[PDB]
Ligand binder design. Structure first.
Ligand SMILES: *[C@@H]1O[C@H](CO)[C@@H](O[C@@H]2O[C@H](CO)[C@@H](O[C@@H]3O[C@H](CO[C@H]4O[C@H](CO[C@H]5O[C@H](CO)[C@@H](O)[C@H](O)[C@@H]5O)[C@@H](O)[C@H](O[C@H]5O[C@H](CO)[C@@H](O)[C@H](O)[C@@H]5O)[C@@H]4O)[C@@H](O)[C@H](O[C@H]4O[C@H](CO)[C@@H](O)[C@H](O)[C@@H]4O[C@H]4O[C@H](CO)[C@@H](O)[C@H](O)[C@@H]4O)[C@@H]3O)[C@H](O)[C@H]2NC(C)=O)[C@H](O)[C@H]1NC(C)=O
Ligand SMILES: *[C@@H]1O[C@H](CO)[C@@H](O[C@@H]2O[C@H](CO)[C@@H](O[C@@H]3O[C@H](CO[C@H]4O[C@H](CO)[C@@H](O)[C@H](O)[C@@H]4O)[C@@H](O)[C@H](O[C@H]4O[C@H](CO)[C@@H](O)[C@H](O)[C@@H]4O[C@H]4O[C@H](CO)[C@@H](O)[C@H](O)[C@@H]4O)[C@@H]3O)[C@H](O)[C@H]2NC(C)=O)[C@H](O)[C@H]1NC(C)=O
Ligand SMILES: *[C@@H]1O[C@H](CO)[C@@H](O[C@@H]2O[C@H](CO)[C@@H](O[C@@H]3O[C@H](CO[C@H]4O[C@H](CO[C@H]5O[C@H](CO)[C@@H](O)[C@H](O)[C@@H]5O)[C@@H](O)[C@H](O)[C@@H]4O)[C@@H](O)[C@H](O)[C@@H]3O)[C@H](O)[C@H]2NC(C)=O)[C@H](O)[C@H]1NC(C)=O
Ligand code: HEM
Ligand code: HEM
Ligand SMILES: *[C@@H]1O[C@H](CO)[C@@H](O[C@@H]2O[C@H](CO)[C@@H](O[C@@H]3O[C@H](CO)[C@@H](O)[C@H](O)[C@@H]3O)[C@H](O)[C@H]2NC(C)=O)[C@H](O)[C@H]1NC(C)=O
Ligand SMILES: *[C@@H]1O[C@H](CO)[C@@H](O[C@@H]2O[C@H](CO)[C@@H](O)[C@H](O)[C@H]2NC(C)=O)[C@H](O)[C@H]1NC(C)=O
Ligand SMILES: *[C@@H]1O[C@H](CO)[C@@H](O[C@@H]2O[C@H](CO)[C@@H](O)[C@H](O)[C@H]2NC(C)=O)[C@H](O)[C@H]1NC(C)=O
Ligand SMILES: *[C@@H]1O[C@H](CO)[C@@H](O[C@@H]2O[C@H](CO)[C@@H](O)[C@H](O)[C@H]2NC(C)=O)[C@H](O)[C@H]1NC(C)=O
Ligand SMILES: *[C@@H]1O[C@H](CO)[C@@H](O[C@@H]2O[C@H](CO)[C@@H](O)[C@H](O)[C@H]2NC(C)=O)[C@H](O)[C@H]1NC(C)=O
Ligand SMILES: *[C@@H]1O[C@H](CO)[C@@H](O[C@@H]2O[C@H](CO)[C@@H](O)[C@H](O)[C@H]2NC(C)=O)[C@H](O)[C@H]1NC(C)=O
Ligand code: NAG
Ligand code: MG
Ligand code: MG
Lengths: 325, 323
């Protein structure tokens, strides 16, 4: 089973004795999530960056007070598209042989770096896949984050900044990336993630939604908590995401083979249709990766698909791409 | 000090031996909030409907698993504008001399029923104040809620139903209430509130976002928990509000002297500017109720303003009406 919520979810020192930062050994895997990167680099996750969904959920909860439903939702979503369902292993970065024997195509078990499954365009501190590297910290983008913190956050990162910067990264991609895609699951995650630094990288004794540019660079670039960093004083994730959505209302869509041809996708879900997004993710995205699984793979798919459904906070009705039972 | 978060926030029986439903005595106070109403009728709050901030915050958390920031934000906003800052008492309903000696005008201490401070138009199950009773359960509107739950919820109330019903109640008021006002604070809370029934009134052992009509009537009409009701399995309030907002985009505004004259207000806060909403609440709303507090009043104001600010989940810069 996925973990339950924390028993004691108060703020506490998480940059402590048993969870020191350490530099990367060769073979250590890091990817497009500064959240999971930091947990790994503090040993809340295995330090090589290869983990079970359960390990990942306990980590985000213990290390950072990510809420339970959000942790279940994101973990099992990633695992379903990016992880190996038999070994129950997911890489938080590049495709690796340490996740075990692969399933048939088109499932690719590419880990969190796999473009177009979880990872997607218009990341705040990462370049679009189309340009070549979709997971490494990018200094130009980060210093754009700083600018926007200066203009909009009086020098801090907060949900007002998130609003502006989220729109700016969208415009950037429309303008430069002929393969820009911003529909369905990526349309969804791209908004919440911009709340995460304000809600979770801010020291929990303060919990005031103003993230400083030191704490920011530390998380985004080095996967390192600040000294004496306390986690937030309660479980949360994308609280305030409506601030980011309403700052510059966008319709989901994509460039159509060239820059500046952003075209609305009338079949995409959006924020008014979360159950449609859940249903698409299950009955199209996951299903296309595993169209005709063997008996063993089917039972693993169904188990993980169960756990995924549990993390859908809107409720919705479970769908069953391989039948009930 | 405001209570902090529950120590143990898991689901548990809350309709219990310690907390039985009991019919109203005469002079028992109930108001426009089904949540506070139900806690008072179960003895989580004082049964007569008059309570401290600290009592209200413990109630909503213990009885229903309202989250600690949302409890502080809502509780100290209400008290600031509707409660007695000297006696530390707020009526969850009508103005009552039971909150103690009134401060001077233009402060009203009208309790939760006070139109235009916290209470406002386009409620799900309460009529707009213009029509003359802004607090009693209204059966025709609940019937619309039942209908919309059949149409969009498969028989149940859920976030998709909340999205359609919130827009329809807006349209209703624009079409019928020449005094419709839907800006600033009321614009913000009217959305979050339509998530509550699906997030909070749903038995905690399911937590599946689908509220049945038996349980909805219970809460909204009789301020009664279902038999064997468990509270939610974690602390929450307005999870999913973005769904309700995007279902039918609306700007803040009001009718101007007549029906079908909805006039957007570009000076209002909206969901993109929660710090401006906080600001305007403190600097215009509270300030105008207490333009010149005596030294004692001013002390109590600042103390409660501090607490209100703690509850502002977006963060924001604290603002100071009295320095
Ligand atoms: C939320 O609301 C609060 C109000 O509830 C906002 O705070 C208020 O901000 C306004 C506008 O900025 C300030 O107005 C300015 O006040 C100064 C003088 O202020 C001094 O005197 C005030 C009066 O004293 C009271 O009590 C005495 C008796 O003891 C009475 O006689 C008085 O009449 C008053 O009742 C006093 O209140 C002030 O104390 C407060 O502020 C100080 C900080 O300065 C704190 O230490 C205190 O603790 C307390 O908070 C203070 O001692 C005026 O001189 C200003 O006039 C200038 O600007 C005008 C336009 O705004 C212009 O018309 C004038 O001609 C003059 O313009 C000139 O000066 C400007 C620079 O000041 C130049 O920029 C300009 O070009 C030109 O050169 C001005 O009216 C209030 O003081 C302040 N009130 C409080 C209680 O703090 C708050 O800003 C709001 N928050 C947000 C985010 O909006
Ligand atoms: C429980 O809650 C409900 C809803 O809030 C409430 O019923 C509502 O009562 C109000 C107040 O009377 C009604 O408002 C009127 O609506 C009609 C429109 O007819 C509608 O019919 C259906 C509903 O059956 C609507 O859904 C549909 O959209 C139709 O439009 C308007 O014509 C009325 O306008 C008159 O009164 C206004 C307010 O005073 C004036 O501003 C306006 O100019 C009109 O005034 C004219 O008549 C006046 C006398 O009435 C007089 O001054 C002049 O002659 C003047 O020219 C009005 O806005 C609303 O429709 C009701 N909704 C329902 C029944 O679904 C219940 O009463 C409430 N229960 C309680 C409080 O106990
Ligand atoms: C709140 O609760 C409601 C209801 O449970 C949820 O609403 C559902 O929303 C989903 C979006 O994810 C809708 O799914 C979409 O359905 C499309 C088809 O629409 C029409 O056909 C449907 C098929 O009905 C079948 O089954 C019924 C009986 O079971 C038979 O009558 C029919 O013959 C069919 O066999 C109808 O149900 C529907 O009314 C339409 O006419 C489909 O093409 C899309 O791909 C997608 O799957 C679904 O339609 C909604 N169901 C209802 C009853 O409204 C909502 O998500 C919940 N919200 C939350 C937040 O929990
Ligand atoms: C629960 C397991 C989680 C998974 C599986 C996950 C996965 C991911 C993935 C795949 C991305 C890349 C999306 C893109 O293209 O930008 C991402 C981005 C992001 N993640 Fe996570 N994440 C998880 C938890 C967290 C946590 C706990 C945090 C911080 C508290 C976090 C913070 C962020 C941020 C801020 C980004 C955007 C990075 C940027 O745009 O520069 N994530 N995450
Ligand atoms: C924290 C203290 C609280 C205060 C001070 C408060 C206050 C109020 C007030 C004044 C209103 C009337 C607004 C209007 O509709 O005109 C309201 C409405 C409402 N409240 Fe609360 N409330 C609190 C907690 C809760 C809780 C814990 C719940 C649990 C679900 C809740 C559920 C609701 C709902 C569903 C409405 C909408 C009623 C309708 O539209 O018919 N409230 N509340
Ligand atoms: C980190 O992300 C930034 C943001 O995009 C990347 O900077 C961009 O780098 C590209 C090529 O390296 C620059 O493109 C060049 O621009 C000229 C026109 O000015 C064009 O004619 C050339 O053909 C070429 O495409 C682009 O200007 C530049 N953008 C900004 C805002 O600096 C950077 O490459 C990323 N770092 C990586 C991928 O390591
Ligand atoms: C829940 O955890 C919190 C934070 O860790 C506890 O409060 C602290 O407990 C630690 C013990 O490791 C003490 O060193 C601190 O002095 C406490 N901080 C305070 C009181 O601000 C709290 O005791 C825990 N609650 C329960 C019921 O175990
Ligand atoms: C999600 O996908 C599954 C599999 O495609 C759908 O189940 C199929 O539905 C068709 C049409 O009713 C049946 O003829 C097949 O036998 C079903 N295959 C099964 C059950 O393995 C399922 O209905 C989809 N769910 C939704 C809500 O669209
Ligand atoms: C937290 O609350 C519950 C009581 O509501 C405690 O355990 C629950 O209640 C009984 C007691 O064992 C169990 O049968 C239930 O399964 C428990 N509910 C759960 C686990 O959701 C629990 O022990 C309390 N405190 C701690 C620290 O767990
Ligand atoms: C609709 O709004 C108007 C105007 O805001 C209210 O008019 C008030 O009337 C009362 C007494 O009848 C006076 O105390 C106020 O001075 C008036 N205000 C203004 C600005 O003119 C009106 O009463 C509201 N209608 C109802 C039925 O509540
Ligand atoms: C982010 O921080 C900024 C600056 O501290 C806050 O923005 C200020 O908000 C006030 C009133 O809301 C306005 O003067 C400007 O919009 C801002 N000032 C400046 C200098 O930009 C903002 O409220 C913060 N947002 C959150 C959610 O904390
Ligand atoms: C982008 O899509 C185009 C057209 O579909 C195709 O050439 C290629 O697969 C993609 N290009 C890159 C650089 O990924
Ligand atoms: Mg990306
Ligand atoms: Mg009302």
């Amino acid at each position: 089973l996925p973990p339950g919520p924390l028993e004691n979810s108060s703020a506490k020192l998480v940059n402590d004795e048993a969870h020191p930062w350490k530099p990367l050994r060769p073979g250590d895997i890091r990817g497009p999530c500064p959240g999971l990167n930091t947990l790994a680099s503090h040993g809340y996750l295995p330090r090589n960056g290869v983990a079970t969904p359960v390990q990942i959920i306990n980590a985000v909860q213990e290390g950072l007070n990510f809420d339970n439903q959000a942790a279940v939702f994101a973990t099992y979503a990633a695992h379903l598209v990016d992880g190996n369902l038999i070994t129950d292993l997911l890489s938080i970065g590049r495709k690796t042989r340490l996740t075990g024997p692969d399933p048939p195509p088109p499932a690719s078990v590419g880990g969190l770096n796999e473009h177009g499954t979880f990872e997607g365009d218009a990341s705040m501190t990462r370049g679009d896949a189309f340009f070549g590297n979709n997971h490494d910290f990018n200094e130009t983008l980060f210093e754009q984050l700083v600018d926007y913190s200066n203009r909009f956050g009086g020098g801090k990162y907060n949900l007002t900044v998130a609003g502006e910067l989220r729109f700016k990264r969208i415009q950037d991609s429309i303008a430069t990336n002929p393969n820009f895609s911003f529909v369905d699951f990526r349309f969804f995650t791209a908004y919440g993630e911009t709340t995460f630094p304000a809600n979770l990288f801010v020291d929990g004794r303060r919990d005031d939604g103003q993230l400083d540019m030191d704490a920011a660079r530390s998380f985004f670039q080095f996967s390192r908590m600040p000294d004496d960093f306390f986690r937030a004083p309660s479980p949360r994730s994308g609280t305030g995401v409506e601030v980011v959505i309403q700052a510059h209302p966008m319709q989901p869509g994509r460039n159509v083979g060239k820059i500046n041809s952003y075209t609305v996708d009338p079949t995409s879900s959006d924020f008014s249709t979360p159950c449609l997004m859940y249903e698409k993710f299950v009955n199209i995205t996951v299903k296309s990766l595993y169209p005709n699984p063997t008996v063993q793979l089917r039972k693993a798919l169904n188990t993980n698909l169960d756990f995924f459904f549990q993390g859908v906070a809107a409720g919705c009705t479970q769908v069953f791409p391989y039948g009930r039972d």
